[PDB]
C-alpha cells in the first residue's frame, strides 16, 4: 500500500526508507504511532556531509477508501506533535487549509543520530476522522536559482503579444465609452518590493503587471500555492515566461526609477533640491494637511525644526506636540539620538 504524492520542482524523490513508515488510525481520543529506523554509513554521510543536496523528508497522505488517484497532496492530522529522537519538529506541515497541496514535508535531517545508533520518529495525534499514511523518503534538493535557469530558456512573452493586449484592452474601453489616456506601471516586484530583474508572468495572465520570476520561485519554496501573485490564476512552472516588453524598459531605465507611464501604442517615459552635505539629513514634517521638507544638521537639536514649522503655521510651539515613531520628541534631542534617516516623517498635532 504505497501512495504517490504530487511531485515538486524543488525536490525529487530518490529512495524510500522502508522502516520509516507508520499508519494513523481513526480515533476520537489521543493517538500515537512511532517508527524506528537505522541508516547506513553511506546514507548518513549522504545526508550529513556539508553542502549536501539531499534530505530525509517525512511525507504524509490521507488514505482514501475509493483508492488513490495519484498526485496526492501532503496532509498531516491536526492537532499533532511530530518528534524525531525526542526533538519536537516545528516545521510548517500545515500549509493552507482551504488549498490542499500547500503543506510541505517535514525535514528529519538535522535530528538524525549517527549511523551506529537507532533513530526514532514519533507522531502524536488526537481526534482523527480519516486515516493517514506516513512515509520517509530521501530527496534531492533543487534551488530556486536552478529553476530560474529553465524559465529563462522558456519562450518569452514577446513585445507583439503585449502590444496586441494594449490594443485589445483599448478598443474594449471605447465600446464601453471609456478612453484610456495613459497607464502608470510599477517596476517594483509585488512579492519582494525590489526592482525587478526578471519580470515575468504566466502566458495565461490577462493583465499587464509582472512579477520577478526568481522571487516568485522563492515564494513557492515558502508555500507551494503556484498561483499568480496578481490575478491568482493557477500557474505551472513551464508556463512562466519573461516579459520582453517589461524587460526592455528595465534595461533602458535608471535604477532609481520605480514607475513608468506608457500609452496604448507601447511608448513609455520614466517617472522622476534634495542634494545635501554628508552632515545634514532630509526630513519631512506634516500636520495632516500641509507638509514642509526640512534639511537640518544631524547634530543640531530638533528644537529649531519645531519652531520653524510652528511659525509657518501661525501657531505657538507650546500648543504643538511632535511625534516620531509614535513617541513624542523633546527639543534637546537631535536626529542622531532618534536614529533618523533621510525622508523620515515627523508628525505634528495640536493639544
Amino acid at each position: 500500500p504505497t501512495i504517490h504524492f504530487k511531485e515538486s520542482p524543488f525536490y525529487k524523490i530518490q529512495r524510500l526508507i522502508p522502516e520509516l513508515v507508520m499508519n494513523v488510525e481513526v480515533t476520537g481520543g489521543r493517538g500515537m504511532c512511532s517508527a524506528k529506523f537505522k541508516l547506513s554509513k553511506a546514507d548518513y554521510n549522504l545526508l550529513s556531509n556539508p553542502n549536501s543536496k539531499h534530505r530525509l523528508y517525512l511525507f504524509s497522505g490521507m488514505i482514501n477508501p475509493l483508492g488513490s488517484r495519484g498526485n496526492e497532496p501532503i496532509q498531516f492530522p491536526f492537532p499533532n506533535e511530530l518528534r524525531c529522537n525526542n526533538v519536537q519538529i516545528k516545521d510548517n506541515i500545515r500549509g493552507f487549509k482551504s488549498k490542499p497541496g500547500t503543506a510541505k514535508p517535514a525535514d528529519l535531517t538535522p535530528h538524525l543520530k549517527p549511523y551506529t545508533q537507532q533513530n526514532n520518529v514519533e507522531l502524536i495525534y488526537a481526534f482523527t476522522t480519516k486515516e493517514y499514511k506516513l512515509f520517509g523518503y530521501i530527496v534531492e534538493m533543487i534551488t530556486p536559482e536552478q529553476l530560474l535557469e529553465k524559465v529563462l530558456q522558456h519562450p518569452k512573452i514577446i513585445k507583439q503579444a503585449t502590444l496586441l493586449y494594449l490594443k485589445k484592452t483599448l478598443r474594449e474601453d471605447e465600446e464601453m465609452g471609456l478612453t484610456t489616456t495613459s497607464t502608470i506601471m510599477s517596476l517594483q516586484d509585488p512579492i519582494s518590493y525590489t526592482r525587478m530583474k526578471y519580470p515575468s508572468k504566466s502566458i495565461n495572465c490577462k493583465h499587464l503587471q509582472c512579477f520577478d520570476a526568481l522571487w516568485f520561485l522563492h515564494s513557492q519554496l515558502q508555500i507551494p500555492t503556484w498561483q499568480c501573485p496578481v490575478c491568482q490564476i493557477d500557474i505551472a512552472l513551464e508556463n512562466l515566461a519573461i516579459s520582453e516588453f517589461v524587460d526592455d524598459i528595465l534595461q533602458n531605465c535608471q535604477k532609481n526609477v520605480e514607475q513608468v507611464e506608457l500609452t496604448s501604442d507601447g511608448k513609455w517615459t520614466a517617472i522622476l533640491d534634495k542634494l545635501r552635505p554628508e552632515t545634514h539629513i532630509n526630513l519631512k514634517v506634516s500636520d495632516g494637511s500641509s507638509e514642509i521638507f526640512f534639511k537640518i544638521k544631524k547634530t543640531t537639536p530638533l528644537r529649531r525644526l519645531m519652531e520653524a514649522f510652528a511659525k509657518r503655521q501661525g501657531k505657538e510651539m507650546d500648543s504643538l506636540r511632535f511625534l516620531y515613531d509614535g513617541i513624542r520628541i523633546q527639543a534637546d534631542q537631535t536626529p542622531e539620538d532618534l536614529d533618523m534617516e533621510d525622508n523620515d516623517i515627523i508628525e505634528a498635532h495640536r493639544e
Partner: protein, 254 residues
C-alpha cells in the same frame, strides 16, 4: 430465531427514549449483522434512523431475517419497569407474533419477564445518507442540548450560521431574539470535549425548534453529537453507540 442480549438494560431504554416522543410506530428489522430500525413522524420531514451492531450486545443470535413491528409508547412502559442495573434480552420465534423482554438482574439474582404483542407496520423509508456535506461539526451533546433548550424558549425556529471558522446559533422570535456563538477547538489533552469543525463551504440553514427539541433527547447515548449540514440536502444529527448509532434526518426550512 432472535436472541439479542443487552449487557446493560438502560442502554436499550435510552435508545427508545431517543425517539418515542416523536414517532409512535417503528419497524425493527433484525438480521445476523445487527438490528436496523428506521421510522418517520407524521410531518414526514424528520426521519429517525437506528443501527445497532453485534459488537454492542453481550451475546447475539439471529438465524433468519426477522422484522419486529412494535409500539413505542407500549414498549417504553415495559422498559420502564426494568432497572438500570439489569440485563435486557429480546427473544422472538422464527415467525413471531410477539416478543419477550427478559430482565435479568446481575446482583440480586432476580428475573422479570415481560411480553409485547407485535404489530404489522407497512411502508418504509430508506435512510438516504448524502455523499458529502457543506460543513461537519461535532461537539459535546450536553452543550448542544443546552443551546437548543435556551433558544427554544425564544423562537420556534433556530438558525445555524457557520462562517469564518465560527458557529453562530440564531433564534429570532416575536417577544425577543438571542444567539449563541461557539468557537472550534481541538485540545489534545482532552479530545473528547472538543468542538471540531470541518468547513468545506459556509452554510446558513434554519430548523424548527420543536424538531431539534426531540433530537437532543438522544444525549443520553453518546457524550458527543455530530451535525452534518448541507445546502441542498437535509441535516444529519448522529449519536454514536459502541457498535451502532442513532441518527436523525431533518430537512431545513426555506
Amino acid at each position: 430465531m432472535l436472541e439479542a442480549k443487552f449487557e446493560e438494560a438502560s442502554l436499550f431504554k435510552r435508545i427508545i427514549d431517543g425517539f418515542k416522543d416523536c414517532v409512535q410506530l417503528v419497524n425493527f428489522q433484525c438480521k445476523e449483522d445487527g438490528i436496523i430500525a428506521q421510522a418517520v413522524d407524521d410531518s414526514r420531514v424528520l426521519l429517525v434512523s437506528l443501527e445497532i451492531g453485534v459488537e454492542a450486545f453481550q451475546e447475539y443470535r439471529c438465524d433468519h431475517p426477522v422484522t419486529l413491528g412494535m409500539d413505542l409508547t407500549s414498549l417504553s412502559d415495559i422498559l420502564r419497569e426494568g432497572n438500570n442495573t439489569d440485563t435486557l434480552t429480546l427473544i422472538a420465534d422464527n415467525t413471531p407474533d410477539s416478543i419477550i423482554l427478559l430482565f435479568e438482574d446481575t446482583k440480586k439474582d432476580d428475573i422479570a419477564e415481560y411480553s409485547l404483542k407485535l404489530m404489522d407496520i407497512d411502508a418504509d423509508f430508506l435512510g438516504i445518507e448524502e455523499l458529502q456535506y457543506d460543513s461537519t461539526l461535532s461537539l459535546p451533546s450536553s452543550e448542544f442540548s443546552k443551546i437548543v433548550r435556551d433558544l427554544s424558549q425564544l423562537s420556534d425556529s433556530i438558525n445555524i450560521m457557520i462562517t469564518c471558522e465560527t458557529i453562530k446559533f440564531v433564534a429570532d422570535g416575536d417577544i425577543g431574539s438571542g444567539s449563541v456563538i461557539i468557537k472550534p477547538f481541538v485540545d489534545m489533552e482532552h479530545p473528547e470535549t472538543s468542538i471540531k469543525l470541518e468547513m468545506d463551504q459556509p452554510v446558513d440553514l434554519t430548523f424548527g425548534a420543536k424538531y431539534l427539541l426531540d433530537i437532543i433527547k438522544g444525549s443520553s447515548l453518546s457524550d458527543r453529537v455530530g451535525i452534518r449540514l448541507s445546502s441542498e440536502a437535509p441535516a444529519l444529527f448522529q449519536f454514536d453507540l459502541k457498535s451502532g448509532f442513532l441518527q436523525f434526518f431533518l430537512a431545513p426550512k426555506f
